[PDB]
């Protein structure tokens, strides 16, 4: 089956943050509006037996002190008094500031994504599902003891850790931004191969995933196991597809992963406020995203599909609705017919004034990168005695 993470409480928490507002509600209600929910197996977010069990789960990656600080940030934001100078210094020491502010639900919001993606991983491990989707997850920037890029807890790292502790995982990061937190977590780990394609340029967040000059690619027994493809602004569906397709296929052939984890941040869409890449959600009766997901699913490897960035909420819903339909089609072999017109539902008016499923958009260095990545993959196979 195809699983999808949702729940009443989960929805409320995923909609409680200042940055992402009600995006998750638009996403799930558009999926529902197109009658996809009956095709899908609801995966309930993970809940724990005790505080100690929750802390044990989260501090598989994060430090206890950071988890403590994040919980304290929530408490402090639930009372009306300003932070003390000492508490400001504490939060600053974990980068719980500026891009990663406190708010009254910051811990519950952050934890919910972890609950969803851990449950998604268990559903794959027990083979209840061949693919699980979590549009509430995908927070790839969070580090062991540092919030970053509005990522407070790295649900992806925790999900991948659960998978490898059940084995090789291929992590594919389609976000506009470099997947630095996940890459770092598994920097010394050859069994989790990470691959991020992203924009990179001087001063662009977060700065990594590019010439450092040479490309760093892991360390210790993890050498050659972190792959990166930085791309210049303006790339369209076809050029992005041609850039990553051979990489994806070669990584699957050489690594033979037991699981694939895909981060599908929607901020590469031409209509995202970043206005960096020119990807679409187009699906001829072709979106770079849909090209990549269809390719990954053709491998028939259990797959976790996560969200991430995406700051045009209706267009992110438009993309992830199509990704969800495509996953149903590829996994179940069942035709999905999505009307070109947005169906009437609670958020119908957010898709105006045209109310189409298509987003409103009219559409050498890469060869160098491919040679470099092929060599690195050769080096990775040699180091790990792969055939
Ligand atoms: C500091 O900013 C960021 C950090 C991480 C990620 C992201 O998407 N992670 O992958 C995105 C942003 N950028 C944004 O907030 C952002 C930037 C420009 C505009 Cl116009 C709107 C937004 Cl919401
Ligand atoms: K990326
Ligand atoms: K790695
Ligand atoms: Zn992003």
Coordinates of C-alpha atoms and ligand atoms in Angstrom, one line a residue:
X1 CA 0.0 0.0 0.0
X2 CA 0.8 3.7 -0.1
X3 CA 0.8 5.3 3.3
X4 CA 0.3 8.9 4.3
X5 CA 0.9 10.5 7.7
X6 CA -2.0 12.5 9.1
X7 CA -4.3 12.9 12.1
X8 CA -6.4 15.6 13.7
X9 CA -3.9 16.6 16.4
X10 CA -1.0 16.2 13.9
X11 CA -2.8 18.6 11.5
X12 CA -3.3 21.2 14.2
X13 CA 0.4 21.0 15.3
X14 CA 1.7 21.1 11.7
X15 CA -0.4 24.3 11.2
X16 CA 0.7 26.0 14.4
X17 CA 3.9 27.7 13.3
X18 CA 4.3 31.3 12.2
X19 CA 6.5 30.5 9.1
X20 CA 4.4 27.7 7.6
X21 CA 0.9 28.8 8.8
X22 CA -1.8 26.5 7.3
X23 CA 0.2 25.0 4.5
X24 CA -0.2 21.5 5.7
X25 CA -3.9 21.9 5.8
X26 CA -4.0 23.2 2.2
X27 CA -1.8 20.2 1.2
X28 CA -4.0 17.6 2.9
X29 CA -7.3 19.2 1.9
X30 CA -6.3 19.3 -1.7
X31 CA -5.3 15.7 -1.6
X32 CA -8.7 15.0 0.0
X33 CA -10.5 17.3 -2.5
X34 CA -9.1 15.1 -5.3
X35 CA -10.5 12.0 -3.7
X36 CA -7.1 10.5 -3.0
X37 CA -7.5 9.7 0.7
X38 CA -9.5 6.4 0.1
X39 CA -6.5 5.1 -2.0
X40 CA -4.1 5.8 0.9
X41 CA -3.4 4.0 4.2
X42 CA -3.4 6.5 7.1
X43 CA -0.2 6.2 9.1
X44 CA -0.7 7.6 12.6
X45 CA 2.1 9.7 14.1
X46 CA 4.2 7.9 16.6
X47 CA 3.5 8.5 20.3
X48 CA 5.6 7.4 23.3
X49 CA 5.0 5.6 26.6
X50 CA 6.7 8.2 28.7
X51 CA 8.8 11.4 28.7
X52 CA 12.0 9.2 29.0
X53 CA 11.0 7.2 26.0
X54 CA 10.4 10.4 23.9
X55 CA 13.7 11.9 25.0
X56 CA 15.5 8.6 24.2
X57 CA 14.0 8.7 20.7
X58 CA 14.9 12.4 20.0
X59 CA 18.4 12.2 21.5
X60 CA 19.3 9.4 19.2
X61 CA 20.4 12.4 17.1
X62 CA 20.0 15.6 19.1
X63 CA 21.8 16.5 22.3
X64 CA 19.8 16.3 25.6
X65 CA 20.8 19.9 26.3
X66 CA 19.4 21.1 23.0
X67 CA 16.2 19.2 23.5
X68 CA 15.9 20.7 27.0
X69 CA 16.5 24.2 25.6
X70 CA 13.9 23.7 22.9
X71 CA 11.3 22.5 25.4
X72 CA 12.2 25.5 27.7
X73 CA 11.8 27.8 24.7
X74 CA 8.2 26.6 24.3
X75 CA 7.4 27.0 28.0
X76 CA 8.9 30.5 28.0
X77 CA 6.8 31.5 25.0
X78 CA 3.7 30.2 26.7
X79 CA 4.0 32.8 29.5
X80 CA 3.7 36.6 28.8
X81 CA 7.0 37.6 30.4
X82 CA 10.0 38.5 28.3
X83 CA 13.0 36.2 28.3
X84 CA 15.7 37.0 30.8
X85 CA 19.2 37.9 29.6
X86 CA 20.4 34.5 30.8
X87 CA 17.7 32.7 28.9
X88 CA 18.4 34.8 25.7
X89 CA 22.1 33.6 26.0
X90 CA 21.0 30.0 26.4
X91 CA 18.7 30.2 23.3
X92 CA 21.4 31.9 21.3
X93 CA 23.9 29.1 22.1
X94 CA 21.5 26.7 20.2
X95 CA 20.7 29.2 17.4
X96 CA 17.1 29.3 18.8
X97 CA 16.8 32.9 17.4
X98 CA 16.5 35.0 14.3
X99 CA 15.4 32.4 11.6
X100 CA 14.4 29.9 14.3
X101 CA 12.4 32.0 16.8
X102 CA 10.4 30.7 19.7
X103 CA 6.6 30.5 19.6
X104 CA 4.0 28.9 21.9
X105 CA 4.0 25.5 20.2
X106 CA 7.6 25.4 18.9
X107 CA 8.5 22.1 20.7
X108 CA 5.2 20.3 20.0
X109 CA 5.3 21.5 16.4
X110 CA 8.9 20.3 15.9
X111 CA 8.2 17.0 17.7
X112 CA 5.2 16.3 15.6
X113 CA 7.2 16.1 12.4
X114 CA 9.5 13.6 14.2
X115 CA 6.5 11.6 15.3
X116 CA 5.2 11.5 11.8
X117 CA 8.4 10.5 10.1
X118 CA 9.3 7.9 12.7
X119 CA 5.9 6.3 12.2
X120 CA 6.4 6.5 8.5
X121 CA 9.7 4.6 8.8
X122 CA 8.2 1.9 11.0
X123 CA 5.4 1.4 8.5
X124 CA 8.0 0.7 5.9
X125 CA 10.1 -1.6 8.2
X126 CA 7.1 -3.8 9.1
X127 CA 6.1 -3.7 5.4
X128 CA 2.6 -2.4 6.1
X129 CA 3.4 0.1 3.3
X130 CA 5.7 0.1 0.2
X131 CA 5.8 3.9 0.2
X132 CA 4.9 6.4 3.0
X133 CA 4.4 10.1 2.5
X134 CA 4.8 12.7 5.2
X135 CA 4.0 16.2 4.0
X136 CA 4.5 17.4 7.6
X137 CA 8.1 16.2 7.6
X138 CA 11.3 17.0 5.8
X139 CA 13.2 19.4 8.1
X140 CA 16.7 18.8 6.7
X141 CA 18.6 21.7 8.3
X142 CA 18.4 20.9 12.0
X143 CA 21.7 19.8 13.5
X144 CA 22.5 17.8 16.7
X145 CA 22.6 20.9 18.9
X146 CA 21.5 23.7 16.6
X147 CA 18.3 24.9 15.0
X148 CA 18.7 26.2 11.4
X149 CA 16.5 27.4 8.6
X150 CA 13.2 27.0 10.6
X151 CA 14.2 23.3 11.2
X152 CA 14.3 22.6 14.9
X153 CA 14.4 18.8 15.0
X154 CA 15.7 16.7 12.2
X155 CA 12.9 14.3 11.6
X156 CA 14.7 13.0 8.5
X157 CA 17.9 12.0 10.4
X158 CA 15.8 10.2 13.0
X159 CA 13.7 8.4 10.4
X160 CA 16.9 7.3 8.5
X161 CA 18.4 6.2 11.8
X162 CA 15.4 4.0 12.5
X163 CA 15.7 2.5 9.0
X164 CA 19.4 1.7 9.1
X165 CA 18.9 0.2 12.6
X166 CA 16.4 -2.4 11.4
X167 CA 21.0 -2.2 5.5
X168 CA 21.8 0.8 3.3
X169 CA 19.7 3.9 2.8
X170 CA 19.9 6.3 -0.2
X171 CA 18.7 9.8 0.8
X172 CA 17.7 12.1 -2.0
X173 CA 17.2 15.8 -1.3
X174 CA 15.2 17.7 -4.0
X175 CA 14.8 20.9 -2.0
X176 CA 16.1 24.2 -3.4
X177 CA 18.5 24.3 -0.4
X178 CA 21.4 22.1 0.4
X179 CA 20.4 19.2 2.8
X180 CA 23.2 20.1 5.2
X181 CA 21.8 18.7 8.5
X182 CA 21.2 15.2 7.0
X183 CA 24.5 15.2 5.2
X184 CA 26.4 16.1 8.4
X185 CA 24.6 13.5 10.5
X186 CA 25.8 10.7 8.3
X187 CA 29.1 12.3 7.2
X188 CA 31.0 9.3 8.7
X189 CA 28.5 6.6 7.7
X190 CA 28.9 4.7 4.4
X191 CA 25.5 2.9 4.9
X192 CA 23.5 6.2 4.5
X193 CA 24.5 7.7 1.2
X194 CA 23.1 11.3 0.9
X195 CA 22.5 13.1 -2.4
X196 CA 21.4 16.7 -2.4
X197 CA 20.7 18.8 -5.6
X198 CA 20.2 22.4 -4.8
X199 CA 21.0 26.0 -5.7
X200 CA 24.3 27.3 -4.3
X201 CA 25.9 30.7 -4.8
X202 CA 27.8 33.2 -2.7
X203 CA 25.8 34.1 0.4
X204 CA 22.9 31.8 -0.4
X205 CA 21.6 29.8 2.5
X206 CA 23.0 27.6 4.0
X207 CA 26.3 27.9 2.0
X208 CA 27.3 24.3 1.9
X209 CA 27.0 21.6 -0.8
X210 CA 29.5 23.2 -3.2
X211 CA 33.2 23.8 -3.7
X212 CA 34.7 24.3 -0.3
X213 CA 38.8 24.6 -3.5
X214 CA 37.4 21.0 -3.7
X215 CA 34.3 19.1 -3.0
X216 CA 34.1 17.5 0.4
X217 CA 32.2 14.2 0.3
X218 CA 32.4 12.5 3.8
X219 CA 35.1 11.3 6.2
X220 CA 36.4 8.2 7.9
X221 CA 34.6 5.1 6.6
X222 CA 32.0 7.6 5.2
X223 CA 34.4 9.0 2.7
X224 CA 32.8 9.5 -0.8
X225 CA 29.3 8.9 0.7
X226 CA 28.0 12.5 0.6
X227 CA 27.0 13.6 -2.9
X228 CA 26.1 17.1 -4.0
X229 CA 25.0 18.8 -7.2
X230 CA 24.9 22.6 -7.0
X231 CA 23.1 24.3 -9.9
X232 CA 22.9 27.9 -11.1
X233 CA 19.7 29.8 -10.9
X234 CA 17.1 29.7 -13.7
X235 CA 17.1 25.9 -14.4
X236 CA 13.9 24.5 -15.9
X237 CA 12.2 21.1 -15.7
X238 CA 14.1 19.4 -18.6
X239 CA 17.6 20.6 -17.6
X240 CA 17.1 19.8 -13.9
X241 CA 15.7 16.3 -14.9
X242 CA 18.6 15.6 -17.3
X243 CA 21.1 16.8 -14.6
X244 CA 19.9 14.4 -11.8
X245 CA 18.4 11.5 -13.7
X246 CA 21.7 9.7 -14.5
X247 CA 23.0 10.4 -11.0
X248 CA 19.9 8.9 -9.4
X249 CA 20.0 5.8 -11.6
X250 CA 23.7 5.3 -11.0
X251 CA 23.3 5.7 -7.3
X252 CA 20.6 3.0 -7.2
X253 CA 22.6 0.6 -9.3
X254 CA 25.8 0.9 -7.3
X255 CA 24.4 1.3 -3.8
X256 CA 21.4 -1.1 -4.1
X257 CA 19.7 0.7 -1.2
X258 CA 17.2 -1.2 1.1
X259 CA 15.3 2.1 1.5
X260 CA 15.1 5.4 -0.3
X261 CA 14.2 8.6 1.6
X262 CA 13.3 11.6 -0.6
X263 CA 13.0 15.1 0.6
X264 CA 10.6 16.9 -1.8
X265 CA 10.8 20.6 -0.7
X266 CA 8.7 22.5 -3.2
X267 CA 10.8 25.7 -3.2
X268 CA 12.2 24.9 -6.6
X269 CA 8.9 25.8 -8.3
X270 CA 9.1 28.7 -10.6
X271 CA 6.3 30.4 -8.5
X272 CA 8.0 30.0 -5.2
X273 CA 8.9 33.4 -3.6
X274 CA 12.6 32.5 -3.8
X275 CA 12.3 32.7 -7.6
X276 CA 15.5 30.7 -8.1
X277 CA 14.6 27.6 -10.1
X278 CA 11.9 27.3 -12.8
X279 CA 10.5 23.8 -12.0
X280 CA 6.8 23.2 -12.4
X281 CA 4.1 20.7 -11.4
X282 CA 3.2 20.0 -15.0
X283 CA 2.2 16.4 -16.0
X284 CA 1.5 15.8 -19.7
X285 CA -1.5 13.6 -20.3
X286 CA 7.2 17.4 -17.4
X287 CA 7.7 18.4 -13.8
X288 CA 11.3 17.8 -12.6
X289 CA 9.8 16.7 -9.3
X290 CA 7.4 14.2 -11.0
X291 CA 10.2 12.9 -13.2
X292 CA 12.5 12.3 -10.2
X293 CA 9.8 10.7 -8.1
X294 CA 8.6 8.4 -10.9
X295 CA 12.3 7.4 -11.5
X296 CA 12.8 6.6 -7.8
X297 CA 9.7 4.6 -7.5
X298 CA 10.5 2.5 -10.6
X299 CA 13.3 1.0 -8.5
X300 CA 10.7 -0.8 -6.4
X301 CA 12.6 0.0 -3.2
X302 CA 10.6 0.9 -0.1
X303 CA 10.5 4.7 -0.1
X304 CA 9.8 7.5 2.3
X305 CA 8.6 10.7 0.7
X306 CA 8.9 13.9 2.8
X307 CA 8.0 17.5 2.4
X308 CA 10.3 20.4 3.3
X309 CA 10.5 23.9 1.9
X310 CA 7.7 25.5 -0.2
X311 CA 6.6 29.0 0.5
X312 CA 3.9 29.4 -2.1
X313 CA 1.4 27.3 -0.2
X314 CA -1.2 26.7 -2.9
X315 CA 1.4 25.9 -5.5
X316 CA 3.1 23.6 -2.9
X317 CA -0.2 21.9 -2.4
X318 CA -0.6 21.6 -6.2
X319 CA 2.8 19.9 -6.5
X320 CA 2.5 17.5 -3.6
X321 CA -1.1 16.5 -4.7
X322 CA 0.4 15.5 -8.0
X323 CA 3.3 13.7 -6.3
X324 CA 0.8 11.8 -4.2
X325 CA -1.3 10.8 -7.2
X326 CA 1.8 9.7 -9.1
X327 CA 2.9 7.6 -6.1
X328 CA -0.5 5.8 -6.0
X329 CA -0.3 5.2 -9.8
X330 CA 3.3 3.8 -9.8
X331 CA 2.9 1.7 -6.6
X332 CA -0.7 0.3 -7.0
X333 CA -0.8 0.3 -10.8
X334 CA -4.1 2.1 -10.7
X335 CA -4.8 5.0 -13.0
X336 CA -5.3 8.4 -11.2
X337 CA -7.4 10.9 -13.1
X338 CA -7.0 14.4 -11.6
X339 CA -9.3 17.1 -12.9
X340 CA -7.4 20.1 -14.4
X341 CA -9.7 22.3 -12.3
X342 CA -9.2 22.6 -8.5
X343 CA -12.3 21.0 -6.9
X344 CA -14.5 22.9 -4.6
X345 CA -13.4 22.6 -0.9
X346 CA -12.6 24.7 2.1
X347 CA -9.5 26.3 0.6
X348 CA -10.8 26.6 -3.0
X349 CA -10.5 30.4 -2.9
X350 CA -6.8 30.2 -2.2
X351 CA -6.3 28.8 -5.7
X352 CA -7.7 31.8 -7.5
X353 CA -8.3 33.6 -9.6
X354 CA -7.7 30.8 -12.2
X355 CA -8.3 27.7 -10.0
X356 CA -6.2 25.4 -12.2
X357 CA -4.1 22.4 -10.9
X358 CA -1.2 23.5 -13.1
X359 CA 0.9 26.3 -11.5
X360 CA 0.6 29.7 -13.2
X361 CA 3.8 29.7 -15.2
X362 CA 4.9 29.8 -18.8
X363 CA 8.2 27.9 -19.4
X364 CA 29.2 22.3 -19.6
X365 CA 29.3 22.8 -15.8
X366 CA 26.7 20.0 -15.5
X367 CA 28.9 17.6 -17.6
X368 CA 31.8 18.5 -15.3
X369 CA 29.7 17.7 -12.3
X370 CA 28.6 14.4 -13.7
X371 CA 32.3 13.4 -14.4
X372 CA 33.1 14.4 -10.8
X373 CA 30.2 12.5 -9.3
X374 CA 30.9 9.3 -11.3
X375 CA 34.5 9.3 -10.1
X376 CA 33.2 9.8 -6.5
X377 CA 30.8 6.9 -7.0
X378 CA 33.6 4.8 -8.3
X379 CA 35.7 5.8 -5.3
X380 CA 32.7 5.0 -3.0
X381 CA 32.2 1.5 -4.5
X382 CA 36.0 0.8 -4.3
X383 CA 36.2 1.8 -0.7
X384 CA 33.1 -0.3 0.3
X385 CA 33.9 -3.3 -1.9
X386 CA 30.7 -2.9 -4.0
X387 CA 30.3 -4.5 -7.4
Ligands
LIG1 C1 16.6 32.0 6.1 O1 15.8 31.6 5.2 C2 15.5 30.3 4.8 C3 16.1 29.2 5.4 C4 15.7 27.9 4.9 C5 14.8 27.7 3.9 C6 14.4 26.4 3.3 O2 13.5 26.3 2.5 N1 15.1 25.1 3.7 O3 15.3 24.3 2.9 C7 14.2 28.9 3.3 C8 14.6 30.1 3.8 N2 14.1 31.3 3.1 C9 12.9 31.8 3.4 O4 12.5 31.9 4.7 C10 12.3 32.8 2.5 C11 13.1 33.6 1.7 C12 12.6 34.5 0.8 C13 11.3 34.8 0.8 CL1 10.6 36.0 -0.3 C14 10.4 34.1 1.6 C15 10.9 33.1 2.4 CL2 9.8 32.2 3.4
LIG2 K1 18.4 19.8 -1.9
LIG3 K1 27.1 9.3 4.3
LIG4 ZN1 14.4 25.0 1.1

